[PDB]
Design a protein around this ligand. Structure first.
Ligand SMILES: Cc1cc(C(=O)O)ccc1NC(=O)[C@H](C1CCCCC1)n1c(-c2ccc(Cl)cc2)nc2cc(F)c(F)cc21
Lengths: 11, 230
């Protein structure tokens, strides 16, 4: 899913 | 031949962002301070690797143009480069000059950290091949950005957009090599050749981690996303 990674990238 | 104004700006900007990293000495001082159990080392590794992913995302977000890329491609780039960046950073620290015999002890400690012997040789073989290149801080910084902006990563939809972003970094790196080693007109290509060996670490990273000599292999939610474990 990469939920955390997507979060860190957008923030 | 020489670095242009735009190239000098790029380099210093890359250097500034690369410098937001956990200082090398902290990691090696700790490993050399005392011997830890395979269990304590697996936990040191997960903590260090989680902080490294977080720093890598921030470094990556600053690469000129990365923000303009399609979001899904941005994920594919980070996900495709995280393991390599981590090993390239570990390679950097491993070859940093230390007091007499300290690097022998650092290598001994790592060799006995818990990783399976199956993976020890390929790892020190890569760190040694890196140390032979005698890379400067600017070279490690540029090579990291080149690794992240690899346009042939898996599930990259728009490869040309990534090539456009990677090319200025290759250009600056190449000019630096043609200067820091006019004596080795191969240095640039030698640096690039190492990226092939780096890529081999993707193949068995999960195996290498699951093979650590511990009874339980606990990762963090972020490491699970990026490493494909748990
Ligand atoms: C993650 C990480 C992040 C940063 C950062 O954010 O700047 C820096 C270094 C590391 N790396 C580590 O902590 C680990 C462990 C070495 C063993 C003990 C725990 C740390 N590490 C590995 C290794 C071995 C095996 C694997 Cl699978 C991955 C890496 N090789 C190393 C070579 C060294 F010279 C060294 F000093 C540490 C080294």
């Amino acid at each position: 899913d990469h939920q955390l990674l997507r979060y860190l990238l957008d923030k | 031949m020489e670095l242009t104004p735009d190239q000098q700006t790029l380099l210093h900007f890359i250097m500034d962002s690369y410098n937001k990293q956990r200082m090398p000495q902290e990691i090696t001082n700790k490993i050399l301070k005392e011997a830890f159990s395979a269990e304590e080392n697996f936990l040191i590794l997960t903590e260090m690797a989680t902080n490294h992913v977080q720093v890598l995302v921030e470094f990556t977000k600053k690469l000129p143009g990365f923000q303009t890329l399609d979001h899904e491609d941005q994920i594919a780039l980070l996900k495709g480069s995280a393991v390599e960046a981590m090993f390239l950073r570990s390679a950097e620290i491993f070859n940093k000059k230390l007091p007499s015999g300290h690097s022998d002890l650092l290598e001994a400690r790592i060799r006995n950290s818990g990783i399976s012997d199956e993976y020890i040789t390929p790892m020190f073989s890569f760190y040694k091949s890196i140390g032979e290149l005698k890379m400067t801080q600017e070279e490690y910084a540029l090579l990291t950005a080149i690794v992240i902006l690899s346009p042939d990563r898996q599930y990259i939809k728009d490869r040309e957009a990534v090539e456009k972003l990677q090319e200025p970094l290759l250009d600056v790196l190449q000019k630096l090599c043609k200067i820091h080693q006019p004596e080795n007109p191969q240095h640039f290509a030698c640096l690039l050749g190492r990226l092939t060996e780096l890529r081999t670490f993707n193949h068995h990273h999960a195996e290498m981690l699951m093979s650590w000599r511990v009874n339980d292999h606990k990762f963090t939610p972020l490491l699970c996303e990026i490493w494909d474990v748990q």
